[PDB]
Every structure is written in structure tokens, then in C-alpha cells.
């Protein structure tokens, strides 16, 4: 059982994120730059993929 | 989950063959679950699965790499009751890629630690130890 109401809450921490292109760091949904030293605070992001 | 037994046969050894598959001989070639020592010949104990060729036997059964299990052993080993068994001769049984024996009947004695592991070789054995 999923429960549709709880699935919003559960997907918030897991799915609804961004990802650094260069260092793969999991980020907040409205970032501009990555937070990490080693990618150079890079601004090339993407959405974290979600299953259909 | 076999307990350690002294290893009496290195890779090179040529042993006898119990079962009715028609092979007289079994020449050992490798051992299953052998790790990594420099220069150590891999060796097998009582009970355990190996690989082998037949050297003389039925002509379809020659020049292939069969799995066998070892059944008697002339090298001595210590049972925990505090004495040292050793058989008269080294001997084994030709076996399938699972672990089942190929040919059903088994001549000779067998060890305790063959019958303790493999269920099928216990049943067909005449008298264990």
C-alpha cells in the first residue's frame, strides 16, 4: 500500500530534488549552484529522475 | 560447511573410481573453493568437490573436465573423538555439475564426512567407515 497522502511526504525527501551534473550530489529543488568544493560550486544541474 | 581434514591429494594425484559410470581412474585437476597461495599445489580432502579427467574408462567419458567427489583417502586425519582414521586407498565418484552423483551404485566403503554432506552418496553406500 502506497497511501497517496503520505506519498507526497515520502517523495519530498527522496524524489523531488536536483542533482549536480559533475559530482552527482543530491541537492534542493530550487538550487542554482552545487554546494560542494570539488565540482567548483558548479551551476550545471538537472532534475532527479522519477519512475513513470 | 565441512570441517577441516588433512589434505591428502594434491592436484597431480591419480585415484580410483567407485561408481558404475565405467571410469577406472580419476586424475585431479582443480578443487572447488580454493583461494590463493603462491606455489601451493591446490589439494582436496575427504568429502569435497573437485574437477577431474578420466585416464582410462569408457571412450565417451574421456578427455573432458568432469566434477567428482572424494570418498576415501589414504592420508590420515583426526576425528574429534581423538583417534586417527585412515583408509586403504584413495577413491572418488564421478558427479554432475550440481553435486549429485552420476552413476548410482557405490563400491567400497565411504567416509563419514562424505555421507554427512551429500545425501545421495549416503543412501547408495554399502557401509560407511
Amino acid at each position: 500500500i502506497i497511501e497517496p497522502s503520505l506519498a507526497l511526504l515520502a517523495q519530498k525527501y527522496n524524489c523531488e530534488k536536483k542533482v549536480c551534473r559533475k559530482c552527482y550530489a543530491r541537492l534542493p529543488p530550487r538550487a542554482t549552484n552545487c554546494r560542494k568544493k570539488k565540482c567548483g560550486h558548479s551551476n550545471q544541474l538537472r532534475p532527479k529522475k522519477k519512475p513513470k | 560447511s565441512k570441517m577441516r581434514v588433512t589434505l591428502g591429494l594434491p592436484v597431480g594425484a591419480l585415484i580410483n573410481c567407485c561408481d558404475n559410470s565405467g571410469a577406472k581412474n580419476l586424475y585431479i585437476i582443480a578443487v572447488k573453493g580454493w583461494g590463493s597461495c603462491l606455489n601451493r599445489l591446490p589439494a582436496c580432502s575427504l568429502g569435497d568437490l573437485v574437477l577431474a579427467t578420466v585416464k582410462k574408462g569408457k571412450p565417451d567419458l574421456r578427455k573432458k573436465v568432469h566434477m567428482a567427489i572424494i570418498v576415501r583417502q589414504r592420508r590420515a586425519w583426526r576425528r574429534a573423538e581423538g583417534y586417527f582414521i585412515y583408509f586403504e586407498d584413495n577413491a572418488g565418484v564421478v558427479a554432475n555439475n550440481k553435486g549429485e552423483m552420476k552413476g548410482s551404485a557405490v563400491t567400497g566403503p565411504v567416509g563419514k564426512e562424505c555421507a554427512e554432506l551429500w545425501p545421495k552418496i549416503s543412501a547408495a553406500a554399502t557401509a560407511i567407515c
Binding site: 497511501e3 503520505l6 511526504l9 515520502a10 517523495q11 519530498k12 527522496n14 524524489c15 519512475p51 | -
Partner: protein, 187 residues
């Protein structure tokens, strides 16, 4: 760089505040938190009409100017601590295996059994100034309540960290425990 900057904080009625040195005791009706601010270069000082607390820095560069409002937000949280408490509701989530959770409610500790069909038991002691009620009548919910924010919200987050999936895709397997709502108890 910048010559002067000063934001001020409104103290509510049923509270008292005693800023000697940098360190700020806040006593209210429910409990009391003390907290030190000997990092920040800043002059805290309350007023003649003593339900207001001004705070100021001279010569603040633009990095260090951003620590004036960080003070206010921490002190404001200490006020709504000692009045109202900080309830953090957390809800359990699972597909197949119902996760079985018990409490030594005074202590307090939270053993978590049968998370994702597992046999390892996962005790989580809370920080000194926070308790854990199992929330009645609503199915599957833990309410964490205490005076401080940072003690409670760690203690909430420690439970989230303990009950985390590994070696499997996190998007399908949503089996966990998560904070639903930040709130207060009293209103």
C-alpha cells in the same frame, strides 16, 4: 565596511530575559533555555521599556552583517520555546511490513523493530531536553516535544537517519519515517 546596523526584537509578555555578557538566559512559564553567543561580534542590550531587545554591530562587513538576523531568529525561537513548546509530528510509512515501535517514555528511547522486514533492532535515545509521546487515535505517528528547537529537530532527524534504506532504489521503496509538521503544542 558599513558604519552601523541594528535590528530589534519584541519580547512577549510572560517571559523574562537576562543578557549578562553575550550569554542569554530566557526564563518563561514552561521551562528555561540558556544559550551562548560568544562567536558573534555584537552588542546585545535591552531597553528602558523592558519588552524590547535591541542588538547592534558597528563596522560590519557584508558577511558578518548576516549574523545580526541569525541572532534574532535564534532568540525568537527561544521565546516561543518557553511559552509554547515545539511539537514535531512524524508519521510512519511502509508497504508490506508494519513497523513496530515502542517507548520508555520518561527516558526516553525509541526501539524500532521490523523496519522493511528486518531483524536488527534500532534503539535511538533522544537528547536530554525532549520527550516522545506515541500519538493516540491517529494511526502510526510519533510526536516529539520539547522547549528547544535544535535539540528537538536533531532528535527528530536522528530517527530519520536510523530508519534509512540501503542497497535498493529509494524512489520505489518509500519505507521510512518523516517529519510531517513543525508546530507548537500550546496556542
Amino acid at each position: 565596511k558599513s558604519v552601523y546596523a541594528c535590528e530589534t526584537i519584541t519580547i512577549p509578555a510572560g517571559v523574562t530575559v537576562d543578557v549578562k555578557s553575550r550569554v542569554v538566559t530566557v526564563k518563561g512559564k514552561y521551562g528555561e533555555i540558556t544559550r551562548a553567543f560568544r562567536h558573534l561580534p555584537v552588542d546585545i542590550q535591552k531597553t528602558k521599556s523592558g519588552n524590547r531587545l535591541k542588538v547592534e554591530m558597528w563596522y560590519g562587513t557584508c558577511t558578518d552583517l548576516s549574523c545580526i538576523r541569525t541572532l534574532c531568529s535564534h532568540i525568537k525561537n527561544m521565546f516561543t520555546g518557553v511559552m509554547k513548546k515545539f511539537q514535531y509530528k512524524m508519521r510512519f510509512v511502509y508497504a508490506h511490513f508494519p513497523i513496530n515501535v515502542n517507548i520508555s517514555g520518561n527516558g526516553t528511547v525509541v526501539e524500532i523493530r521490523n523496519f522493511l522486514g528486518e531483524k536488527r533492532v534500532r534503539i535511538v535515545k533522544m537528547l536530554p531536553g525532549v520527550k516522545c509521546e506515541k500519538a493516540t487515535n491517529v494511526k502510526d505517528e510519533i510526536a516529539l516535544t520539547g522547549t528547544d528547537v535544535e535539540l528537538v529537530s536533531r532528535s527528530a532527524a536522528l530517527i530519520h537517519q536510523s530508519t534509512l534504506v540501503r542497497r535498493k532504489d529509494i524512489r520505489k521503496f518509500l519505507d521510512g519515517i518523516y517529519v510531517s509538521e513543525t508546530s507548537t503544542v500550546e496556542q
